[PDB]
Every structure is written in structure tokens, then in C-alpha cells.
PDB file of C-alpha atoms in Angstrom:
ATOM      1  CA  UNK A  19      68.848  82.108 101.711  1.00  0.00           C
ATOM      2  CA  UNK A  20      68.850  85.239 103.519  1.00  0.00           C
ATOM      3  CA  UNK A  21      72.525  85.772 103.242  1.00  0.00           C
ATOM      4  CA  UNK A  22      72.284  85.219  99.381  1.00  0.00           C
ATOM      5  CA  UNK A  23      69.412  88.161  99.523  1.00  0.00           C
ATOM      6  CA  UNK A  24      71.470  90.402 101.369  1.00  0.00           C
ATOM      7  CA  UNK A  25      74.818  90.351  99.244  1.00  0.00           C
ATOM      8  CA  UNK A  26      71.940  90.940  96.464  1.00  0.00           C
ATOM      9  CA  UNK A  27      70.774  94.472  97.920  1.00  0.00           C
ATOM     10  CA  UNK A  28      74.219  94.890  99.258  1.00  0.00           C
ATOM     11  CA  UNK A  29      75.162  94.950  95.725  1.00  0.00           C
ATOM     12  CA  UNK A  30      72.399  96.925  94.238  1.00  0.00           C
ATOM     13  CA  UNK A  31      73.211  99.526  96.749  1.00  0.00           C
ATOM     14  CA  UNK A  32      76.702  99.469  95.401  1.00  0.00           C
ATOM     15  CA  UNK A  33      75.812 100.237  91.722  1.00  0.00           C
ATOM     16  CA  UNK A  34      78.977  97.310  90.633  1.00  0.00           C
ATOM     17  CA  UNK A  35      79.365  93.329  91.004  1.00  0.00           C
ATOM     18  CA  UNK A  36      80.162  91.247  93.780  1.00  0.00           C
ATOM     19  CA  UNK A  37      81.775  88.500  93.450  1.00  0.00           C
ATOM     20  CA  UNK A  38      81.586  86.083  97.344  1.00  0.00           C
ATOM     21  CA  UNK A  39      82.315  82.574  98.535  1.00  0.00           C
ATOM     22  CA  UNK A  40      82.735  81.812 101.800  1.00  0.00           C
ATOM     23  CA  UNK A  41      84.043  78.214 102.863  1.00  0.00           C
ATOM     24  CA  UNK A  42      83.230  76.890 106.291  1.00  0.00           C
ATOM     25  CA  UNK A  43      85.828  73.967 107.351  1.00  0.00           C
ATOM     26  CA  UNK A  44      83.621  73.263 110.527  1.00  0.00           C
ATOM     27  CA  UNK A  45      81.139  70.813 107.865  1.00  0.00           C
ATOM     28  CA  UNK A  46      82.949  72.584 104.924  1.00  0.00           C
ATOM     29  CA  UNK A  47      79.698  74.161 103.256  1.00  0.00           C
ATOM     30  CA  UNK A  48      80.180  76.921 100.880  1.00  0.00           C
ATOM     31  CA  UNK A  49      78.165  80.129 100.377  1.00  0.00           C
ATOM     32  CA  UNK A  50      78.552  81.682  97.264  1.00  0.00           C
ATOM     33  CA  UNK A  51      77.454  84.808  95.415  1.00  0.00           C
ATOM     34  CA  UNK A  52      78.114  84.830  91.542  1.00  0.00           C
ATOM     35  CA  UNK A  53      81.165  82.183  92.699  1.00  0.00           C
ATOM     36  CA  UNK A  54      81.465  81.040  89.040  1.00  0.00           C
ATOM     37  CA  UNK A  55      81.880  84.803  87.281  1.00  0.00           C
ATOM     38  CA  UNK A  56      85.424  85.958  86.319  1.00  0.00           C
ATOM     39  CA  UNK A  57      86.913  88.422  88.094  1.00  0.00           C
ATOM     40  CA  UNK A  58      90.021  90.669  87.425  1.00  0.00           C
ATOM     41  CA  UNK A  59      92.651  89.598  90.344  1.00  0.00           C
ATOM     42  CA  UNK A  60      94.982  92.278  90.485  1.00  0.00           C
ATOM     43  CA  UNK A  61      97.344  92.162  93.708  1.00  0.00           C
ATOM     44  CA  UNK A  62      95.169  88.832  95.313  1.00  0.00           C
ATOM     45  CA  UNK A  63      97.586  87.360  92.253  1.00  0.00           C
ATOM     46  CA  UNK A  64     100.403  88.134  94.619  1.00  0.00           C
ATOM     47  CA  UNK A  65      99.713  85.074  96.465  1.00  0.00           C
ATOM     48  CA  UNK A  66     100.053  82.339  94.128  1.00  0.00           C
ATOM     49  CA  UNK A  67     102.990  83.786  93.068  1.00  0.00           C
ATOM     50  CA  UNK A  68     104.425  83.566  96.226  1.00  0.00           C
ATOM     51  CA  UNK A  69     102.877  80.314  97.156  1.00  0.00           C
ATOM     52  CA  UNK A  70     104.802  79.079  93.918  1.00  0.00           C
ATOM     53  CA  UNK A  71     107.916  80.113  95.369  1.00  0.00           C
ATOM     54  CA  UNK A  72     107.654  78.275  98.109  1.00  0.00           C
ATOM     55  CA  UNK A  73     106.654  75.236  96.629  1.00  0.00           C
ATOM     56  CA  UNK A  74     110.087  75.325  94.930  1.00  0.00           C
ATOM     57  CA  UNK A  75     111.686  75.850  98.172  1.00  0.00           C
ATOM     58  CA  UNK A  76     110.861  72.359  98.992  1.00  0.00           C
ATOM     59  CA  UNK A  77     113.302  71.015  96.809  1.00  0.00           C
ATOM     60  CA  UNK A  78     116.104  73.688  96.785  1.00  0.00           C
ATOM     61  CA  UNK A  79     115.954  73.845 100.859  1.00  0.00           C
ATOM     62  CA  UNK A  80     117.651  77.186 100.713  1.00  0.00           C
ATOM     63  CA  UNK A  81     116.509  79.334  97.724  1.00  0.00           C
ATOM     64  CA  UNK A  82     114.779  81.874 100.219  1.00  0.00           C
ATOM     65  CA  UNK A  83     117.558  83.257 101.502  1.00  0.00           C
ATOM     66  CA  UNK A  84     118.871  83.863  97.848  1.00  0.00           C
ATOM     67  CA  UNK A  85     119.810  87.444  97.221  1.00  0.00           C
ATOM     68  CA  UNK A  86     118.094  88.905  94.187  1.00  0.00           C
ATOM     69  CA  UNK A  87     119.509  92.820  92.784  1.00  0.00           C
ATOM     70  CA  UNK A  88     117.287  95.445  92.861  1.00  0.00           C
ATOM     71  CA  UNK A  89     118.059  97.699  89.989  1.00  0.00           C
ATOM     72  CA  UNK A  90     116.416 101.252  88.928  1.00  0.00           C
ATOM     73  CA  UNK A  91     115.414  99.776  86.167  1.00  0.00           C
ATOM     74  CA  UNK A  92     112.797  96.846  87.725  1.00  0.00           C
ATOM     75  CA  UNK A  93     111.012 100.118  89.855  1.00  0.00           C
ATOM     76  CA  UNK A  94     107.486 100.095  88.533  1.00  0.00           C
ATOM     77  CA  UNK A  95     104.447 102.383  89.884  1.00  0.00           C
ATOM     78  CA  UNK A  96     104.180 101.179  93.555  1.00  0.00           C
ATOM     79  CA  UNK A  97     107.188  99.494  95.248  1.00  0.00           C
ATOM     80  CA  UNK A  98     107.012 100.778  98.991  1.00  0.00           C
ATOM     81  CA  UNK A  99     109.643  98.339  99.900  1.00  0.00           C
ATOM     82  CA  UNK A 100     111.983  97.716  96.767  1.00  0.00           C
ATOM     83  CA  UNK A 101     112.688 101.206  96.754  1.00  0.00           C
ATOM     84  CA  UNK A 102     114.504 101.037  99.878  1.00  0.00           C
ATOM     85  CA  UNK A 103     116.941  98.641  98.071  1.00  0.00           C
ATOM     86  CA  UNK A 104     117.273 100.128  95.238  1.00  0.00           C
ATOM     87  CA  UNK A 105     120.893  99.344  94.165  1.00  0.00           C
ATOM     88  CA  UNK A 106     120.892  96.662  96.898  1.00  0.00           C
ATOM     89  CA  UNK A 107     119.608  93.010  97.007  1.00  0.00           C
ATOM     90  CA  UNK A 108     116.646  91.226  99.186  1.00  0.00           C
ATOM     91  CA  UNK A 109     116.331  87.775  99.770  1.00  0.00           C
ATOM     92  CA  UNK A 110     113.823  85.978  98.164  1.00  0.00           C
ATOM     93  CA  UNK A 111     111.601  85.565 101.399  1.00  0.00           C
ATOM     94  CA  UNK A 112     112.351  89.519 101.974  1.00  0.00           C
ATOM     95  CA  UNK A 113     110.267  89.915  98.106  1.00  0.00           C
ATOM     96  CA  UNK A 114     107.440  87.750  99.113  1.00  0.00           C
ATOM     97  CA  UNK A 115     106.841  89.392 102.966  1.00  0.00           C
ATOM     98  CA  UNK A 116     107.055  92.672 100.784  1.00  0.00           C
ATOM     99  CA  UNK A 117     104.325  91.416  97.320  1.00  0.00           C
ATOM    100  CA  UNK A 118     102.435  90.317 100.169  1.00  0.00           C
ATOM    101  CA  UNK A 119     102.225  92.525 103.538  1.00  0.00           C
ATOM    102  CA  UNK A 120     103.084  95.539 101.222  1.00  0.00           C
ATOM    103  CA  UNK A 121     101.591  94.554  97.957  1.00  0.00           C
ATOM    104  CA  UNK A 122     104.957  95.619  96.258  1.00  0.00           C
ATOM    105  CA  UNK A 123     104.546  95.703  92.849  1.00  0.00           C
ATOM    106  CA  UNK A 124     108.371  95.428  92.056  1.00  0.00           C
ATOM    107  CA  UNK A 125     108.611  92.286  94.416  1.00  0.00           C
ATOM    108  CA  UNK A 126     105.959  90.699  92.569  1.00  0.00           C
ATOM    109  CA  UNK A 127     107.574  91.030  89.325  1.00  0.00           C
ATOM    110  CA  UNK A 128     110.922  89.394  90.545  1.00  0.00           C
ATOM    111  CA  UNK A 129     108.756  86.232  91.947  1.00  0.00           C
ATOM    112  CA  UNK A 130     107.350  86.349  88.156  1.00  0.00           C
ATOM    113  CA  UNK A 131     110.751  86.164  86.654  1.00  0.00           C
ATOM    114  CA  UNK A 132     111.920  83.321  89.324  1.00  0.00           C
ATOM    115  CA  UNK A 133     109.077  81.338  88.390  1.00  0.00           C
ATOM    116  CA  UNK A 134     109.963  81.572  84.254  1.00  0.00           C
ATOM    117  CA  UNK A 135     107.616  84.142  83.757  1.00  0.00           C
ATOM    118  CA  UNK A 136     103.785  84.681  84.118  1.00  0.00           C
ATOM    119  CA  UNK A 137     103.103  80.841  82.622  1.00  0.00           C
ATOM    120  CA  UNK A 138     104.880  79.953  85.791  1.00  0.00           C
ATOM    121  CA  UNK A 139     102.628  81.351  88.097  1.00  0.00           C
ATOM    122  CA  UNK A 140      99.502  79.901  86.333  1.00  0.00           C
ATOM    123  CA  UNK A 141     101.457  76.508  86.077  1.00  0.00           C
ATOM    124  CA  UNK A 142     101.864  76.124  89.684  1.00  0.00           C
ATOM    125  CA  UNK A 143      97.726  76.725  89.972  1.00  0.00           C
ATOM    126  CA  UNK A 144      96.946  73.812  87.931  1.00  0.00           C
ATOM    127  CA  UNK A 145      99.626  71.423  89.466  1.00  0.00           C
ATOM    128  CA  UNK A 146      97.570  72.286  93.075  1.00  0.00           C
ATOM    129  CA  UNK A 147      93.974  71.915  91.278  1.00  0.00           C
ATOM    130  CA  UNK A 148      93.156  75.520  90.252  1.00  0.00           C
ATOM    131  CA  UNK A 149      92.140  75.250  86.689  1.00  0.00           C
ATOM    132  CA  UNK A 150      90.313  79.135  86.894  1.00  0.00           C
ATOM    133  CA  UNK A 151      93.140  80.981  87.599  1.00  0.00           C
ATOM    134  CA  UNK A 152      95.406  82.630  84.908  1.00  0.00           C
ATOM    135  CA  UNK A 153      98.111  85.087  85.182  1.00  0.00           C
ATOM    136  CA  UNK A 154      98.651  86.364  81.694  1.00  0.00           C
ATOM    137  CA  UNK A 155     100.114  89.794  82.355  1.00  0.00           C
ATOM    138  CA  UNK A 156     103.486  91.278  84.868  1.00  0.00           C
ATOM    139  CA  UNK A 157     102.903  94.549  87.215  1.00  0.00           C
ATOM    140  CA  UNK A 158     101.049  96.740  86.098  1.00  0.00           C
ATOM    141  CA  UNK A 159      99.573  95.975  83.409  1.00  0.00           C
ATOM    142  CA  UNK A 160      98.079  93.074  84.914  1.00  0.00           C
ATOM    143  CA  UNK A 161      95.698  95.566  87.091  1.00  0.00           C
ATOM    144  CA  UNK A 162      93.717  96.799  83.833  1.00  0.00           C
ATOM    145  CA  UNK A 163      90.499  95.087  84.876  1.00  0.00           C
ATOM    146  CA  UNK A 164      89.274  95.891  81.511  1.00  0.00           C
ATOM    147  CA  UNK A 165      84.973  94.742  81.686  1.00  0.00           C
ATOM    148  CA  UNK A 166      84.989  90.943  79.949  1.00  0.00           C
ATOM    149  CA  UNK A 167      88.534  90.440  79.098  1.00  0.00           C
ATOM    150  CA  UNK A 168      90.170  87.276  80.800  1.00  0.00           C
ATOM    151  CA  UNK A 169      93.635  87.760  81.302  1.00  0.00           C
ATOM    152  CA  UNK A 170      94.684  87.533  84.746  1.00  0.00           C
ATOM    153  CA  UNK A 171      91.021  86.271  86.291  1.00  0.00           C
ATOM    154  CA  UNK A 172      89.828  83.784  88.860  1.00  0.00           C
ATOM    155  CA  UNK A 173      86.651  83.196  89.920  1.00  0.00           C
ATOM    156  CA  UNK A 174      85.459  83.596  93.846  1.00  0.00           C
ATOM    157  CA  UNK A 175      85.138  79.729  94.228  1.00  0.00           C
ATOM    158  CA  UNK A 176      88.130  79.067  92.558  1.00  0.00           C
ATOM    159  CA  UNK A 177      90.216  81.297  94.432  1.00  0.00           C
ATOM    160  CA  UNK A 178      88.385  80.425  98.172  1.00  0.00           C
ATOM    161  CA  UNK A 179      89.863  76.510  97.054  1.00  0.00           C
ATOM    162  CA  UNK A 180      92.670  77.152  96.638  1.00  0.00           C
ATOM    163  CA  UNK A 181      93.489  79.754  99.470  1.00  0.00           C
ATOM    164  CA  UNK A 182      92.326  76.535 101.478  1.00  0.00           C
ATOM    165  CA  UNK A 183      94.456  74.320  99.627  1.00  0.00           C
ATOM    166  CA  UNK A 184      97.232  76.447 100.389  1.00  0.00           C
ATOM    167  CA  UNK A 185      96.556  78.014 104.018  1.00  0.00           C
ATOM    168  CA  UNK A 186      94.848  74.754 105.573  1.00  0.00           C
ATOM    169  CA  UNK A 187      95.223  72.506 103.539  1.00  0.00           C
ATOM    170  CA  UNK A 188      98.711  70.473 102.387  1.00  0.00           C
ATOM    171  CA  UNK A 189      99.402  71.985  98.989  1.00  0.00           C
ATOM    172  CA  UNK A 190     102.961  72.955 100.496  1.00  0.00           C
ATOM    173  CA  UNK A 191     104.938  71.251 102.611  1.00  0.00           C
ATOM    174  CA  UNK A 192     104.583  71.722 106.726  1.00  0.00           C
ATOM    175  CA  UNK A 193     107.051  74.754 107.183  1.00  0.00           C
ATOM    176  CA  UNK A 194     106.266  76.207 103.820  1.00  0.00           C
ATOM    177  CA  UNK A 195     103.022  76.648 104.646  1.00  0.00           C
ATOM    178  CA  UNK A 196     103.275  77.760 108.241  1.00  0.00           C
ATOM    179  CA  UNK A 197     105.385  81.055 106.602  1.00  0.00           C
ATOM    180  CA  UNK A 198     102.468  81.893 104.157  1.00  0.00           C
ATOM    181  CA  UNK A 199     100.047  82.371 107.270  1.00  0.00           C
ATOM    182  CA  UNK A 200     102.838  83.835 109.266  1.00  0.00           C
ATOM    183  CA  UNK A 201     102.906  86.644 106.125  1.00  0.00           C
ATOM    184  CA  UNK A 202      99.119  86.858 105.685  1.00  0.00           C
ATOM    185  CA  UNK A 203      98.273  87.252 109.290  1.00  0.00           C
ATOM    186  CA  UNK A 204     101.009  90.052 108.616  1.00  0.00           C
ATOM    187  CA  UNK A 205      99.818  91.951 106.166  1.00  0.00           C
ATOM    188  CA  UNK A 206      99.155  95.751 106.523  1.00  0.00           C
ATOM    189  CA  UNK A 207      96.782  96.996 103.953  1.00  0.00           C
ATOM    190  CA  UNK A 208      93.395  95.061 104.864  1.00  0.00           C
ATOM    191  CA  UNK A 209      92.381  97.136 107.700  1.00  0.00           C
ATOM    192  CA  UNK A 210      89.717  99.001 105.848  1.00  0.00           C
ATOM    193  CA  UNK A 211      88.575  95.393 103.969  1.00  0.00           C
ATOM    194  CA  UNK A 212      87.193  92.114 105.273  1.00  0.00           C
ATOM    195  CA  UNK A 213      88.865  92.374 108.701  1.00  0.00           C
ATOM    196  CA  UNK A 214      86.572  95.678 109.303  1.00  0.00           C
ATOM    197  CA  UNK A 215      83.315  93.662 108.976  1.00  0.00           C
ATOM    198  CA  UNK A 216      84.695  91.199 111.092  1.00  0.00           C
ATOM    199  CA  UNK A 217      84.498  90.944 114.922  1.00  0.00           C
ATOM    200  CA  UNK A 218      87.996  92.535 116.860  1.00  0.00           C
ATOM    201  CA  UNK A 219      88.532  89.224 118.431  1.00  0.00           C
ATOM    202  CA  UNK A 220      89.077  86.983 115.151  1.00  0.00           C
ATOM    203  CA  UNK A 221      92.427  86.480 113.325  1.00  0.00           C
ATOM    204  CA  UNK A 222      92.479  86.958 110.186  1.00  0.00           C
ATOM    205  CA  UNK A 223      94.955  86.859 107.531  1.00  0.00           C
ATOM    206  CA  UNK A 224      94.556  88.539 104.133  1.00  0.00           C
ATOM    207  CA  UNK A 225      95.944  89.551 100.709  1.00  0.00           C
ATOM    208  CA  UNK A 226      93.492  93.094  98.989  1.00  0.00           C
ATOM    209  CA  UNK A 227      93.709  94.136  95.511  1.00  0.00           C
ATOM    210  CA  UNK A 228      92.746  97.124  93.729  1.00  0.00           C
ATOM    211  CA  UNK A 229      92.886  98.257  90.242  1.00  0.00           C
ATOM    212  CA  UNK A 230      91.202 100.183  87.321  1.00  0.00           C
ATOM    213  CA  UNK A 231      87.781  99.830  87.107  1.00  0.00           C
ATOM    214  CA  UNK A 232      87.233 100.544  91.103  1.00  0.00           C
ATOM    215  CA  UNK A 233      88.461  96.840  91.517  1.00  0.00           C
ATOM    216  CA  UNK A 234      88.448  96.632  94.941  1.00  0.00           C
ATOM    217  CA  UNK A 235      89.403  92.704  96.149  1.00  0.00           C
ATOM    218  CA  UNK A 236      90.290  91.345  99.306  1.00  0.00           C
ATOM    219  CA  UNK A 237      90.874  87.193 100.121  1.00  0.00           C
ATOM    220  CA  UNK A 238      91.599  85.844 103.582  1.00  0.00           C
ATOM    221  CA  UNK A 239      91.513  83.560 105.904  1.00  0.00           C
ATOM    222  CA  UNK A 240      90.027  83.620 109.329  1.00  0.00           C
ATOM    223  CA  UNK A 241      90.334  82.223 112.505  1.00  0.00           C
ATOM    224  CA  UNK A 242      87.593  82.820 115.241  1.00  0.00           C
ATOM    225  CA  UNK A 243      87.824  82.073 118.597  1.00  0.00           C
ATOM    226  CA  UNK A 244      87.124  78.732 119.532  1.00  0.00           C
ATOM    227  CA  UNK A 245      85.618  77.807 116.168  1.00  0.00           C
ATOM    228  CA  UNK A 246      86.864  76.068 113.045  1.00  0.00           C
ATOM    229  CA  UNK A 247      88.545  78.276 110.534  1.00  0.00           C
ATOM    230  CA  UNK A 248      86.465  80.698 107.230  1.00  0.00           C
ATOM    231  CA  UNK A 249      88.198  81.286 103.873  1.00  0.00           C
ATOM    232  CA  UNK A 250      86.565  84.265 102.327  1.00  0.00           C
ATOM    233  CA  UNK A 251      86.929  85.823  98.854  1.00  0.00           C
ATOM    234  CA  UNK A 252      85.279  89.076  98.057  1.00  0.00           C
ATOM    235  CA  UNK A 253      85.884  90.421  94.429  1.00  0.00           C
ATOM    236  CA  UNK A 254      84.150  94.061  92.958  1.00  0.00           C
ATOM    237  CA  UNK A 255      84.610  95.917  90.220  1.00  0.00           C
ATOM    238  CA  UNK A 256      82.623  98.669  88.542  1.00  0.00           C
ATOM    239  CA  UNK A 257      81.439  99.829  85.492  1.00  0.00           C
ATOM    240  CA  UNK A 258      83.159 103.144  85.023  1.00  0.00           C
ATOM    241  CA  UNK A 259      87.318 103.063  84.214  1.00  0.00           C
ATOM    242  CA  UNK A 260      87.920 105.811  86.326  1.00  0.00           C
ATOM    243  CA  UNK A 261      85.230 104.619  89.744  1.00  0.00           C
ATOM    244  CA  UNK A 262      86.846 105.251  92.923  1.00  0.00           C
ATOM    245  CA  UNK A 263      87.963 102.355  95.581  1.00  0.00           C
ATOM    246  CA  UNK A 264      85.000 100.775  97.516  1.00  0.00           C
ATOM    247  CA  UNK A 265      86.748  98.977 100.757  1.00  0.00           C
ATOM    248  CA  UNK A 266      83.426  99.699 102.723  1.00  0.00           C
ATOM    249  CA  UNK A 267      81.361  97.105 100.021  1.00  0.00           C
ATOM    250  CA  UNK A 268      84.253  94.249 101.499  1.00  0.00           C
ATOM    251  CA  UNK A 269      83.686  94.914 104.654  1.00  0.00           C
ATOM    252  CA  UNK A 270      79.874  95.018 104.385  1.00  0.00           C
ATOM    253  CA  UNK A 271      80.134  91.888 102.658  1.00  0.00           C
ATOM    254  CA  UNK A 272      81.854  90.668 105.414  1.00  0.00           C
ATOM    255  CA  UNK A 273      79.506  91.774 108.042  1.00  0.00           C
ATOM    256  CA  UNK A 274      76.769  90.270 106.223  1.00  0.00           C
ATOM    257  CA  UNK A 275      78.252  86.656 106.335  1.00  0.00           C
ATOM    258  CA  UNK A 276      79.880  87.143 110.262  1.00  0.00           C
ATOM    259  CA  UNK A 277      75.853  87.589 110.756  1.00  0.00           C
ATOM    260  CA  UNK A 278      75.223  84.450 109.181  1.00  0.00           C
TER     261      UNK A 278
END
């Protein structure tokens, strides 16, 4: 496959590990590039949390609108949003829009504690299919990306599933799911990612992550024109604890399969 031999040099170039897989839901054929390696997470956790959330909003019809205290105290290293209610509340909606259009490290931690702690995120993955995915560890310590360790890994194929599941799929209930995509197509820290390999004209709607080890993830889903819907997950980390961000590797990799 010529795709599989460009992500190869793509890689090579890049000196770290790539982690793809794309799903196509126009005959729903998968490409994937080291799709069954672990790979350290870090914010692209911030959707299952959320997702989780929501799937509890099913039942309890109103628990997004339920105010939640924002104390100096819960501030951890990046919290964009919380910090403008410090001493306030937001709504439980107004901490998933922020974990996920912000990646607000603060608003992720209170969707931990809503969910019974970090068990509660990974539960909700296996009730939906995941059986990859674990969330051991609560902002920021979850970032470490520490070469070999599992805690709070995925794989690419795992993850592109269950994005699917979530996005296009009926994992959560009609409205529940309609907000997600309404928040991904929102987010505003993926401009340098996936969406710059990617033609202008195609929506897309993504979640990044970036942590020690020049982790540098990005998972979304797309929409072009007159076509069916792409998920695609692009994971990368690097071999030196201190390696600098490498956005331009997503976007290549997304170039590479927009070309395919």
C-alpha cells in the first residue's frame, strides 16, 4: 500500500512513532499504521470523559445544567476557562464545552470526580465496546507519557471505534450525541493538527493532545463535501522527555491519507 509506505518515511523523517487509523464509513475499510501499539492519550482522554457524562444525562434528563463550584483549590496547570470562575460555579455542559474546545485541565478533573473517579471513565469505555482504553491517572499526571508504561493508553484502532461509536454511531442517545459533534466541530486548538492537512472545504471536528515526551495527538472526525464521513486518529510521541511539540507530523499524516 502506498499510503502504508508513506506514513513509513513520514515517520522516519520524524525521528518518533506514529501511531494512524483511518476509518472510511463510505464501505467502512480501515487503514492503519501500527493501529494495535499503545499510545499515551493525554487530553484525546477528554472525550470519553465527556462522552460518559452524557451518557448519564440520559437518565437524569437534567444533570447538565447542574452547577458544579469552582474552588482555588481544583486549579491545576492549564485551566483557560475554570479560571474565569474561580470562586463561581459552571454547569456541567459549561465543563465539558471547556475539557473539550479548550482542553481545560480543571474541567476535566470535575467530569472525573462526577463519574466516581478515573475507574469511571474507563468503565463507561467497556460498557460501549472499548476494551483498549484505560484512564488510570487525573490531570496532570495523566500526561506523563512515560516510553512503555500503560496507564492512561489506547491504541489508534481502538480509539478510531469508538470515536465512531460515539460521533456516528448510537452509543448515546439522539440529542446526546448531536451536542458532542456540536462541541468537536467547536473546538479551538486543532488548527495547526489534522484539519491543516486537510482540504479548507471539509468539516471537521476534533479533540488534540499533547504531553511529555513530545506527545503530540489529535482524533477527529470529518465530513467532506458530498462524501460519506472519515474518523481519523493520529498518535506521536518521541523518544526524548523533554522533545518539543510536532503538530506539522499530524497534519502531514493527514495530507498523506486526504491523497489517498
Amino acid at each position: 500500500s502506498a499510503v502504508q509506505q508513506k506514513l513509513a518515511a513520514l515517520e522516519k523523517s520524524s525521528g518518533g512513532r506514529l501511531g494512524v487509523a483511518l476509518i472510511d464509513t463510505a464501505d467502512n475499510t480501515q487503514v492503519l499504521y501500527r493501529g494495535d501499539e499503545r499510545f499515551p492519550m493525554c487530553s484525546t482522554s477528554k472525550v470519553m470523559a465527556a462522552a460518559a457524562v452524557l451518557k448519564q444525562s440520559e437518565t437524569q434528563k437534567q444533570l447538565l445544567n447542574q452547577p458544579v463550584e469552582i474552588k482555588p483549590a481544583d486549579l491545576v496547570n492549564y485551566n483557560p476557562i475554570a479560571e474565569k470562575h474561580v470562586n463561581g460555579t459552571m454547569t456541567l455542559a459549561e465543563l465539558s464545552a471547556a475539557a473539550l474546545q479548550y482542553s481545560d485541565n480543571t474541567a476535566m478533573n470535575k467530569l472525573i470526580a462526577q463519574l466516581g473517579g478515573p475507574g469511571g471513565v474507563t468503565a463507561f469505555a467497556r460498557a460501549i465496546g472499548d476494551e483498549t482504553f484505560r484512564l488510570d491517572r487525573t490531570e496532570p499526571t495523566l500526561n506523563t507519557a512515560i516510553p512503555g508504561d500503560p496507564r492512561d493508553t489506547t491504541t489508534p484502532r481502538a480509539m478510531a471505534q469508538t470515536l465512531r461509536q460515539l460521533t456516528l454511531g448510537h452509543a448515546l442517545g439522539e440529542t446526546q450525541r448531536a451536542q458532542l459533534v456540536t462541541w468537536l466541530k467547536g473546538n479551538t486548538t486543532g488548527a495547526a493538527s489534522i484539519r491543516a492537512g486537510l482540504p479548507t472545504s471539509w468539516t471537521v471536528g476534533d479533540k488534540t493532545g499533547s504531553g511529555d515526551y513530545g506527545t503530540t495527538n489529535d482524533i477527529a472526525v470529518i465530513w467532506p463535501q458530498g462524501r460519506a464521513p472519515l474518523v481519523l486518529v493520529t498518535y506521536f510521541t518521541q523518544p526524548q522527555q523533554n522533545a518539543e511539540s510536532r503538530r506539522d507530523v499530524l497534519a502531514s499524516a493527514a495530507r498523506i491519507i486526504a491523497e489517498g
